[PDB]
Amino acid sequence: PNFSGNWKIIRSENFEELLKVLGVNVMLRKIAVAAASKQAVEIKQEGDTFYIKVSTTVYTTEINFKVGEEFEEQTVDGRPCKSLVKWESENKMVCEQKLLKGEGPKTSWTKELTNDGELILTMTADDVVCTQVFVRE
Numbered sequence: 001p002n003f004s005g006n007w008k009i010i011r012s013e014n015f016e017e018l019l020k021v022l023g024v025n026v027m028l029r030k031i032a033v034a035a036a037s038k039q040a041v042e043i044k045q046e047g048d049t050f051y052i053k054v055s056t057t058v059y060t061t062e063i064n065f066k067v068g069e070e071f072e073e074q075t076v077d078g079r080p081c082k083s084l085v086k087w088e089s090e091n092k093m094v095c096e097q098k099l100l101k102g103e104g105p106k107t108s109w110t111k112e113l114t115n116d117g118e119l120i121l122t123m124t125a126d127d128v129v130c131t132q133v134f135v136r137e
Ligand SMILES: *C/C=C(C)/C=C/C=C(C)/C=C/C1=C(C)CCCC1(C)C
Pocket: 032, 033, 035, 036, 039, 052, 054, 055, 056, 059, 063, 075, 076, 077, 109, 111, 121
């Protein structure tokens, strides 16, 4: 594969419905949808080690992991979790998450590089799947 690059969002679907499952109230959901439309992702991949920076206009967060090794990050709605990334194929990885504290919907995410040069991110809470599509800058 190779996920390395600077990626800019071109499409974002079902993000509000995801936030709704996660308990976010309507006005905040609308503002978060707007923020998501400015999302940028920077990736550096070395073998199965990933450094990922996801940002919007006013916020930035860094995700560092190695495939197959547990790490800590946060769920979409901001709750600390334990995460584990595995490959599903040559160019797709899937992350399963578990809340460090309490209960909540079952969340996960995937990243995929398509043959047409897009990066597809999916984020899931229970039955609801958000799909976001990026292209290289
Ligand atoms: C591997 C790529 C991942 C895990 C991308 C994670 C992206 C986020 C957690 C972004 C979340 C956002 C919200 C929850 C609302 C505001 C808009 C975003 C895109 C910053």
